[PDB]
Amino acid sequence: PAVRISDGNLIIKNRTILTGVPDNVITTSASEAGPVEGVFVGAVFNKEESKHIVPIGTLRNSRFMSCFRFKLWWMAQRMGEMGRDIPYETQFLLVESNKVYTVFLPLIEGSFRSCLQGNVNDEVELCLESGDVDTKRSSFTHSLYIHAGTDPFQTITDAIRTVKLHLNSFRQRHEKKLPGIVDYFGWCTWDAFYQEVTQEGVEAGLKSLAAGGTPPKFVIIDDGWQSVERDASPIFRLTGIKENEKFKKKDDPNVGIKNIVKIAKEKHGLRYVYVWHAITGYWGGVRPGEEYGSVMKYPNMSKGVVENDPTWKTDVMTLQGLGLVSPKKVYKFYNELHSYLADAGVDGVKVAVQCVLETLGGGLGGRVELTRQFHQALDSSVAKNFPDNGCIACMSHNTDALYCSKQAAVIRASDDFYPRDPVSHTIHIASVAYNSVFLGEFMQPDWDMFHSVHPAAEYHASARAISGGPLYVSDSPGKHNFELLRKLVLPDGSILRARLPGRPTRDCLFADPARDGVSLLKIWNMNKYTGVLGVYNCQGAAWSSTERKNIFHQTKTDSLTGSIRGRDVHSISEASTDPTTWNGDCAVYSQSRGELIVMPYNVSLPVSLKIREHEIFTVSPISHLVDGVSFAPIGLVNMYNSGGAIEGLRYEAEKMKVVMEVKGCGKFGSYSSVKPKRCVVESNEIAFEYDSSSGLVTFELDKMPIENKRFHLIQVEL
Ligand SMILES: OC[C@H]1O[C@H](OC[C@H]2O[C@H](OC[C@H]3O[C@H](O[C@]4(CO)O[C@H](CO)[C@@H](O)[C@@H]4O)[C@H](O)[C@@H](O)[C@@H]3O)[C@H](O)[C@@H](O)[C@H]2O)[C@H](O)[C@@H](O)[C@H]1O
Numbered sequence: 001p002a003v004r005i006s007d008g009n010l011i012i013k014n015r016t017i018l019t020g021v022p023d024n025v026i027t028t029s030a031s032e033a034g035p036v037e038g039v040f041v042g043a044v045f046n047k048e049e050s051k052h053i054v055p056i057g058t059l060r061n062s063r064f065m066s067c068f069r070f071k072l073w074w075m076a077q078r079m080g081e082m083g084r085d086i087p088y089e090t091q092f093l094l095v096e097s098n099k100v101y102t103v104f105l106p107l108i109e110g111s112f113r114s115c116l117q118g119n120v121n122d123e124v125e126l127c128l129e130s131g132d133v134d135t136k137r138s139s140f141t142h143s144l145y146i147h148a149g150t151d152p153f154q155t156i157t158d159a160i161r162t163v164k165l166h167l168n169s170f171r172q173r174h175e176k177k178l179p180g181i182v183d184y185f186g187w188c189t190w191d192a193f194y195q196e197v198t199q200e201g202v203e204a205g206l207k208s209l210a211a212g213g214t215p216p217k218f219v220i221i222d223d224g225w226q227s228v229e230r231d232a233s234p235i236f237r238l239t240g241i242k243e244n245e246k247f248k249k250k251d252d253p254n255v256g257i258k259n260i261v262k263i264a265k266e267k268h269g270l271r272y273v274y275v276w277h278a279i280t281g282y283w284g285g286v287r288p289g290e291e292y293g294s295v296m297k298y299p300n301m302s303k304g305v306v307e308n309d310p311t312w313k314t315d316v317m318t319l320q321g322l323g324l325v326s327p328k329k330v331y332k333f334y335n336e337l338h339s340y341l342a343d344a345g346v347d348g349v350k351v352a353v354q355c356v357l358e359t360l361g362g363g364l365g366g367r368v369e370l371t372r373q374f375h376q377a378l379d380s381s382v383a384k385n386f387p388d389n390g391c392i393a394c395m396s397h398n399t400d401a402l403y404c405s406k407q408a409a410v411i412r413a414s415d416d417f418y419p420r421d422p423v424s425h426t427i428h429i430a431s432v433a434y435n436s437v438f439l440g441e442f443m444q445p446d447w448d449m450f451h452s453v454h455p456a457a458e459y460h461a462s463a464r465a466i467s468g469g470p471l472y473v474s475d476s477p478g479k480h481n482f483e484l485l486r487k488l489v490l491p492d493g494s495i496l497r498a499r500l501p502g503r504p505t506r507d508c509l510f511a512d513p514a515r516d517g518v519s520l521l522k523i524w525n526m527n528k529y530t531g532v533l534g535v536y537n538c539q540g541a542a543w544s545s546t547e548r549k550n551i552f553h554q555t556k557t558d559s560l561t562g563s564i565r566g567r568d569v570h571s572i573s574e575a576s577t578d579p580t581t582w583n584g585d586c587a588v589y590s591q592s593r594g595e596l597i598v599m600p601y602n603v604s605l606p607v608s609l610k611i612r613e614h615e616i617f618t619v620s621p622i623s624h625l626v627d628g629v630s631f632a633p634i635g636l637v638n639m640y641n642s643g644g645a646i647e648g649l650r651y652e653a654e655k656m657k658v659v660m661e662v663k664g665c666g667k668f669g670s671y672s673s674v675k676p677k678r679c680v681v682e683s684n685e686i687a688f689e690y691d692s693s694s695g696l697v698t699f700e701l702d703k704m705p706i707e708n709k710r711f712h713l714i715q716v717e718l
Pocket residue numbers: 071073074190222223276352394395415416
């Protein structure tokens with residue numbers, strides 16, 4: 001059978017994972033397709049309730065990684081070995097058996113949402129909640145799915161796919177359409193002006209970035225553009241769907257947000273303009289009234305949320321309530337808002353405050369149903385009005401929204417970049433990476449804005465470059481480091497985006513790089529013909545289970561030594577042009593030191609980093625043309641994700657030749673065991689340098705491709 005409950009134990013491929021599984025916990029592997037390689041898990045209770053806790057069994061001596069909600073809106077990571085260390089509001093749990101990896105996916109079932117939590121006796125408890133005292137139930141069959149496998153990343157993907165086939169309520173990341181913003185540099189107004197943003201400020205930011213040679217091609221007009229008012233520190237509520245006076249042209253107040261849109265696009269060459277709104281309209285919802293059936297609703301506290309984030313009990317939203325648009329009118333609300341924006345030339349929305357819905361289901365069939373209804377309406381309106389799929393999900397890390405993510409393709413992966421909070425930087429990097437392990441199954445992770453002028457700029461920028469996600473700053477106008485931005489952004493505003501969600505390496509999945517005082521975090525991604533690896537020291541700070549907020553904590557050393565290997569890039573074989581004959585040797589380029597090293601298969605290279613330092617490595621499979629003639633493309637060596645520039649690669653061993661298609665401009669690098677005879681770009685021989693000690697070949701790609709002609713055609717004759 002393979003995953004099974006026997007005697008009182010949960011057994012996975014002949015390893016006991018849980019003991020003391022109680023008799024009322026039921027399993028099934030049946031499906032309409034049919035037998036499934038894991039087990040759905042439920043339980044039967046005596047009483048109908050709107051909340052149940054049930055132990056699934058006892059976990060001891062098994063290393064785990066968990067993603068848990070430290071705030072309502074947002075997850076972070078926790079590792080451990082005992083059930084007692086499993087946080088409240090655990091939404092994703094991965095367990096290592098010492099070789100076999102087991103995923104636990106607590107699910108939505110009917111009107112109920114589940115999560116996991118640990119107890120003092122080391123039990124892993126399943127917590128099932130409808131979010132509404134009127135919505136009650138006494139038995140469940142599919143509230144948790146458990147699946148095991150030998151590759152931890154494949155195990156997670158396979159488990160998600162099985163849940164999808166049972167629920168049919170979401171699609172996997174790879175089945176969705178990415179909006180076109182993810183291929184361009186952008187700018188977000190949020191940290192530049194906060195809610196004091198004006199149309200002149202938007203224009204000044206677009207102009208200042210473009211002037212330094214790194215032109216953004218998308219803009220997010222963040223919180224502050226909307227027409228909002230306090231009731232007749234008081235909460236603001238939405239009072240109409242159009243923009244406020246700061247976005248009406250001063251000249252003609254009848255021309256609204258279309259003015260800044262046309263300025264952005266026609267005068268400054270932007271492609272996309274997005275705006276922020278809350279899933280409820282504004283922070284205080286929408287002012288009560290009959291037009292969208294808005295009525296006052298006050299957040300209901302759930303125990304697990306409040307145990308981890310006690311300030312939510314006295315948040316302005318909790319105490320002052322939200323005007324909640326009616327489910328009967330929610331499509332009308334989004335569709336009138338979004339029709340107005342789209343008719344003004346707006347291409348998408350950043351939709352924030354998403355998880356509040358789970359607290360507002362009391363009148364209305366509970367957390368799952370209300371979430372599903374608002375998302376169904378949001379998705380219809382987005383698909384109508386922003387048909388490039390222009391939606392970024394924000395403050396949305398609840399399983400109620402994840403398991404109905406049928407269309408939206410970009411998700412903010414962590415709590416906000418905080419330019420003024422020194423504790424936040426190392427935390428942010430760990431959180432984006434670990435959360436991306438689970439969130440990247442549903443949507444492309446967005447690792448958030450950052451500042452190009454800031455002590456942690458390079459640390460943040462480097463992580464964005466390897467994230468696979470949208471790349472955007474929130475710089476105040478005129479506060480730019482263009483030397484840093486040139487490592488991210490080409491002269492036409494395009495970026496070198498990697499192909500996958502950036503995630504921790506296999507090595508790092510079970511070792512906490514914020515708390516263990518011993519390990520570096522390694523983040524891997526893939527391009528088409530190289531891998532990429534980012535190494536970070538993020539020790540010294542993390543969410544505290546006793547203070548219930550992010551704090552600094554003590555470290556034994558400042559500096560830590562770890563190591564890298566080619567195969568740390570988990571999917572590196574996929575970059576090889578001949579994976580069946582490849583021996584696993586890679587060329588490894590350090591983009592900060594500018595050093596090229598050949599690393600044989602399995603050979604480790606030491607890396608030492610102090611807290612808040614990082615290093616980026618481009619990792620390229622070596623091709624052996626003939627004895628003594630070996631090559632690997634590196635890419636745009638003065639960019640962080642250098643290998644993202646290589647769009648085609650063919651070896652012609654019979655002519656001793658390499659044929660490449662390369663996007664961008666700047667210095668191009670490659671590994672060759674021999675000095676090339678000639679390097680040719682677009683039919684003309686060009687000069688080049690060769691370091692015979694390292695094998696590094698280097699030449700300049702002078703300008704971006706002429707036309708249109710999207711790539712430089714390069715021939716390296718060995
Ligand atoms: O609004 C635009 C913003 O929306 C998303 O982020 C929202 C943000 O909300 C919560 O933090 C709000 C706020 O808290 C801190 O600010 C103060 C400082 O004491 O605390 C008050 C609110 O409680 C606030 O008035 C104070 O100024 C913080 O320093 C500040 O940055 C925050 O904005 C929530 O805790 C947080 O996790 C976030 O979700 C979106 O993610 C942003 O990109 C942006 O669009």
